[PDB]
Ligand SMILES: Nc1ccn([C@@H]2O[C@H](COP(=O)(O)O)[C@@H](O)[C@H]2O)c(=O)n1
Ligand SMILES: Nc1ccn([C@@H]2O[C@H](COP(=O)(O)O)[C@@H](O)[C@H]2O)c(=O)n1
Ligand SMILES: C[N+](C)(C)CCOP(=O)(O)O
């Protein structure tokens with residue numbers, strides 16, 4: 001098999017297939033996939049048809065898989081206008097939450113960004129694109145890049161974790177040349193890499209450079225991360241990626257992106273395992289209603305996906321394929337164990353064992369920049385609340401965790417409980433909060449938007465439409 | 470047609486048919502019907518098969534409908550053991566919430582309760598039945614009944630609205646005789662009654678006496694109120710009854726029971742109208758999930774119900790049938806308008822018109838004993854919260870309603886928001902509560918169980934099973 005990982009695409013539950021396109025950050029607030037589909041009707045099926053039809057295209061070819069700009073252009077056309085930008089300006093903002101100091105350093109060092117005329121710096125959105133107060137690619141002394149990357153990062157934080165102050169204007173000179181150059185470097189380097197980790201590092205390093213060069217007018221994310229990225233992953237015999245936040249392939253470093261991709265691959269493994277074990281899938285605090293599933297099942301239309309669901313992987317060992325991805329993802333195990341536990345662990349006994357002998361600093365630990373986005377500035381408590389992890393929240397409350405701690409968005413465990421509409425988790429926190437003398441001060445905590453937990457609670461489930469009801 | 474009201478049984482939406490058996494008080498907390506079915510598996514279908522098979526039995530008979538003890542016994546057998554109690558003791562407790570001063574007066578005046586040896590009074594549950602501190606049927610001076618009925622009622626309140634202090638031990642002498650006597654009185658009196666209101670008064674008066682004489686060892690409620698009661702209602706060309714609390718046919722008066730039955734008939738009219746208008750049915754704060762409906766549709770098994778759904782009422786005018794029930798229920802219109810509005814009204818404009826020119830005493834009005842059970846001791850605010858009436862709660866908040874007022878169970882609008890798990894209504898109340906100086910005092914309000922709103926919120930959706938999860 002040219003793409004042995006296609007086995008995991010087949011194992012992926014049909015009724016949850018949208019999860020490899022819809023960012024996990026949206027699930028709880030937008031009825032899983034519904035909000036993503038309403039923004040661009042037809043976009044889920046087109047993205048699924050694009051992935052499956054091109055993966056089937058590579059598999060049905062004797063020759064060994066080689067990345068090409070024709071491959072990329074076909075992927076863009078399918079996600080839809082098939083052609084590259086020439087002179088067209090493309091820009092976007094980047095919040096602190098989608099950045100890292102090591103990531104900023106690397107981005108400033110991309111020679112094609114300096115020669116291509118790309119711009120990056122602090123500023124404001126203007127009538128025809130960003131109005132830069134500064135552009136870091138103007139007179140950039142390469143010696144100053146480590147110190148400037150620290151400054152840019154602290155400046156992005158000053159504005160707010162989820163707020164956009166920094167803008168990026170892509171390259172407008174020789175996009176076709178850079179596209180071909182990135183492709184050549186990939187094909188040369190991938191052949192060099194011997195281990196799976198080396199391969200992953202090469203893949204993420206190239207996907208990042210493809211994203212940063214924003215070659216298309218639209219759909220760069222879906223093209224490169226939700227499609228392209230999954231092909232070399234499957235080539236390696238790995239599952240495709242289910243992301244919480246895929247929009248990190250600009251200001252994150254290649255090293256930190258390996259971790260981001262591994263966590264995304266782990267999500268797919270949890271999705272498959274839960275479905276196989278007849279367990280109700282609960283990842284990122286989202287429980288799909290039967291109405292949501294039936295609406296998706298009736299909406300689903302992808303012939304190339306149907307061919308993969310009935311594909312013959314009899315001449316392939318699923319056990320060796322399973323043991324290989326388990327070994328590859330084992331690097332995830334000893335990093336922010338309380339945080340990962342609050343996301344993945346549901347067994348009361350495993351949770352109790354994990355929280356044993358842990359101190360006040362470990363239970364209240366807020367992860368710093370560089371970790372995959374969901375962790376940054378968050379306590380295990382914030383993470384239990386967003387994941388619906390009642391067993392973890394109970395253990396944390398028993399461990400005397402501080403529930404008034406605000407994350408980098410100014411949000412407490414109470415703001416997320418209100419935002420997710422969880423009455424039970426909200427009740428547990430409020431029972432705790434009111435048993436302490438500063439109860440009223442804690443309830444009145446305003447986040448970065450000057451909003452209280454009860455302001456969000458008051459807006460929970462409020463229609464997105466102009467309706468009297 | 471012998472039972473023209475059968476037309477309304479046909480109009481009743483199949484997927485909501487359980488609503489004429491499951492008390493509206495359970496809906497929000499027990500996933501509509503699920504909790505009722507789990508207490509006695511098979512009990513919903515048996516009750517539906519009993520109603521439809523006997524109604525079909527009366528319709529398929531030339532002779533005019535006459536109540537008989539054979540009819541009653543057949544109904545009991547079908548709800549299941551078909552036979553009457555002889556010597557067997559049957560007892561139950563009655564809380565203040567299921568009583569009225571006028572109702573207590575009438576009950577003490579039932580001559581068959583004195584001669585039959587029934588007991589009623591304050592007390593405690595004992596190993597073999599109640600342990601009476603007093604029995605009002607011992608040396609009852611009929612002159613003292615109005616003053617004693619007031620005392621009994623105030624004593625039942627002292628214990629708590631939803632708490633049981635008063636016990637009733639049914640008749641153990643000549644049940645067969647009283648059953649026949651109640652039946653004869655009914656058949657004689659119904660022929661006397663000329664108007665629909667007179668007929669209703671006779672029906673409720675007799676159903677009450679049948680309930681109070683508890684002739685069966687089990688299922689007296691279902692037999693007499695969910696089955697028997699619906700036959701003369703349909704005979705009159707009226708819809709069957711959908712109740713919030715049917716367990717009022719012991720200590721409520723015949724006059725107050727006409728109102729209880731009219732409100733129950735109005736519920737059926739709202740159910741039918743909402744289904745006909747493709748409106749999602751929301752009565753008593755319960756919105757059925759598609760899983761709940763499909764589980765009920767697959768569980769539903771009643772051949773006699775199937776015959777009624779395809780029955781031919783072509784030789785009957787549905788318009789005259791509709792205009793007659795509208796006239797009959799119009800008595801409901803000018804009683805506790807803010808309360809009924811909080812239950813039934815969803816249109817922002819109608820609600821705003823209704824709350825115009827209303828004072829502080831009208832907006833904060835708590836209904837007294839005698840009204841149908843859902844109203845007693847409740848403000849329009851408590852009622853909006855239990856009904857999910859967001860448009861009414863907004864109007865009430867704008868009208869400066871007091872949200873800290875506790876009902877006869879010691880519960881505030883906040884306790885019901887927590888109990889119903891409504892994040893949005895909870896948020897609205899908390900935004901209000903925190904903007905006032907005594908915020909903390911309001912949140913810490915304990916009901917009759919010494920429980921806070923957040924104690925209930927912490928227990929919302931907690932499993933009823935021994936499960937680790
Ligand atoms: N319908 C869509 C399409 C894209 N997106 C957002 O855009 C990201 C990918 O960017 P592209 O538009 O470049 O494909 C997604 O991860 C998601 O955050 C969305 O939110 N709804
Ligand atoms: N399965 C059942 C059957 C009856 N009930 C309760 O009993 C009442 C009727 O009493 P019976 O058992 O006499 O029929 C119902 O209105 C309801 O409150 C219940 O809660 N669950
Ligand atoms: C959000 N993003 C910066 C990762 C991709 C946006 O791509 P595009 O839609 O501008 O082409």
Ligand SMILES: C[N+](C)(C)CCOP(=O)(O)O
Pocket residue numbers: 559560561683685686687688689690715716717719
């Ligand atoms: C609850 N109730 C008093 C109206 C009826 C109980 O009847 P039963 O179940 O004791 O026969």
